[PDB]
Each structure stands twice: as C-alpha cells, then as structure tokens.
C-alpha cells in the first residue's frame, strides 16, 4: 500500500472524458472505510 499525496487523505479520480461516468476514490488506510451493507444479487440479461 502506497501513501496519500502529502496533505491529503484520499484521491478522487474524476473522469474528465466520459461524461456519464461517476467518480472513483482511493484511500491508503484500511481504517478509513467500514463495510456497512453486504448486497447479494444477480445481474439481469436485458430484454
């Protein structure tokens, strides 16, 4: 595991090209996330 940029606690990947894409984020410390919900699913074959 790497380090945050100095002075920062995480990175935000803001997609600049694909307008429909939402953001992605990166933390460098496990203790900065808590897994609250476990979701069990299937993807659905489209019509």
């Amino acid at each position: 595991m790497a380090h945050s940029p100095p002075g920062h606690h995480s990175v935000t990947g803001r997609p600049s090209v694909n307008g429909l894409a939402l953001a992605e984020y990166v933390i460098y410390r496990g203790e900065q996330a808590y897994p609250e919900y476990l979701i069990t699913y299937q993807i659905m074959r489209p019509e």
């Binding site: 606690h9 995480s10 990947g13 894409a21 953001a23 992605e24 476990l38 659905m44």
Partner: protein, 161 residues
C-alpha cells in the same frame, strides 16, 4: 465478532440501498467484457454488517481526519467489489485488499457507479468470471458487493481519461 442482520425488502433502509445500487448502473467502455451485459440487477438479499471493533476503529480514524480537515470527515457511501468480501466483513479492509496496479496507485478503490464495482467482483478485469461457469457475464451465479462508509477527508483531485 461480525454478525449479519437481514433487512426486509419492506424496510425503507433496504429500499434506499437497493435504489443507490440500481440507479448507479451505467454502460462501460469495455462493452461488458469485465462485468457482463445488464442494465439492472436482481437484488436477492441485503445485510447490515455489525462489528463493534471494526466500527470503533473506523470512527477513531474518522475523528482524526476530521480534526485535520476543518471538522469535516467528507464521508461518502460508496461501492466496493471484490473476491475477498468474506474476509473484509470479518477482519476489515487492509493492504491485502489494495489495488497495486490501480490508476491512482496502490490503495483501496471505491466507486460511485455500482456497475463499476461489479467489474471487480470476480477479480481485476473480471478475472475468469464466475467460479461455476467461467462466465464474466453469468446471469445465474450469485454476486456480492459492499456498500461502504468511506472517510475521504481532504481528497486530492485527479482528472483522468
């Protein structure tokens, strides 16, 4: 010391989580290669993860970040897709769940798009798909995602492709 509490599909908490899952599906530039081809999910179950130790550990660190960022933890709810969700819910996130070749470096990655985290459920690039059928687009096998509370604090902003 983890326990899983089933939410009823009639509970509003189930419903708001389902909604964030379904409404954040998008199309992917790989045409479905990594995560398969779908516009929505069949949600089979939603469980609340309860672990005292892992929670206190999260809130302790959240206060530190907050105090370093004008009392603002900048907390989000984001999706994480991984082969190791069973280890994550019992022992928490650590460096064993880091994405060493990630675009923004070796850390633990989260998505606003549920469909993005889905691409990692069977491994990086979707791995070899479901264990049963070796199908990255399996419509039969059960998948699991986590919807997580993530402390971002002061986030470095990286514009990207």
């Amino acid at each position: 010391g983890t326990i899983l509490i089933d939410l009823s599909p009639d509970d509003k908490e189930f419903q708001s989580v389902e909604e964030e899952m379904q409404s954040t599906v998008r199309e992917h530039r790989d045409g479905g290669h990594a995560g398969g081809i779908f516009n929505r999910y069949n949600i089979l179950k939603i469980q609340k993860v309860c672990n005292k130790k892992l929670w206190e550990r999260y809130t302790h660190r959240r206060k530190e970040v907050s105090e370093e960022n004008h009392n603002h933890a900048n907390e989000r709810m984001l999706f994480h897709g991984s082969p190791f969700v069973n280890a994550i819910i019992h022992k928490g996130f650590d460096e064993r769940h880091a994405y060493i070749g990630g675009m923004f470096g070796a850390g633990i990655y989260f998505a606003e798009n549920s469909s993005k985290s889905n691409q990692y459920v069977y491994g990086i690039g979707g791995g070899t798909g479901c264990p049963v059928h070796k199908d990255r687009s399996c419509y039969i096998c059960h998948r699991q995602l986590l919807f997580c509370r993530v402390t971002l604090g002061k986030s470095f902003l990286q514009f990207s492709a």
